[PDB]
Design a protein around this nucleic acid. Structure first.
Ligand SMILES: [Mg+2]
Ligand SMILES: [Mg+2]
Ligand SMILES: [Mg+2]
Ligand SMILES: [Mg+2]
Length: 66
RNA sequence: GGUCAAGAUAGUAAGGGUCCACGGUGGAUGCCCUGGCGCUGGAGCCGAUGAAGGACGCGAUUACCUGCGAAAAGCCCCGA
């Protein structure tokens, strides 16, 4: 989830959540390219999550150096 | 009436012409606005914190355009 769930965790946990998300996105690319990709949306959704992650760990890393 | 004779005149149009009817072509005309034009008034700088302008990308499907920039038709908080 966008706000809550992210900030509560460590910047070393972010790297992990990122990585796993990357991997799922690639799985979905293989599937899609082979067909069918029953749930397209998930792709975009995962994308968003990645963004959120990198936003948070950015924000936080600069708020802990405020 | 019939034969002959002398004389005169008609219709048929292969194609054309004038007019009428009915179409085709074509895009004038009328109506319209999603686009412009001028005037007045406002507002007036951007850039090494990387500009103006681009290239290549980002889409479930994406060639063009728009928006964006590997956090890629978008991510965070605030306000409506
Ligand atoms: Mg004829
Ligand atoms: Mg383009
Ligand atoms: Mg990056
Ligand atoms: Mg909001």
């Amino acid at each position: 989830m966008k706000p809550s769930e992210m900030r509560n965790l460590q910047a070393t946990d972010f790297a992990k959540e990122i990585d796993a998300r990357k991997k799922e996105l690639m799985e979905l690319r293989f599937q899609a390219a082979a067909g069918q990709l029953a749930q397209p949306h998930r792709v975009r959704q995962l994308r968003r999550e990645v963004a959120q992650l990198n936003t948070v760990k950015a924000e936080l890393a600069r708020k802990g150096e405020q």
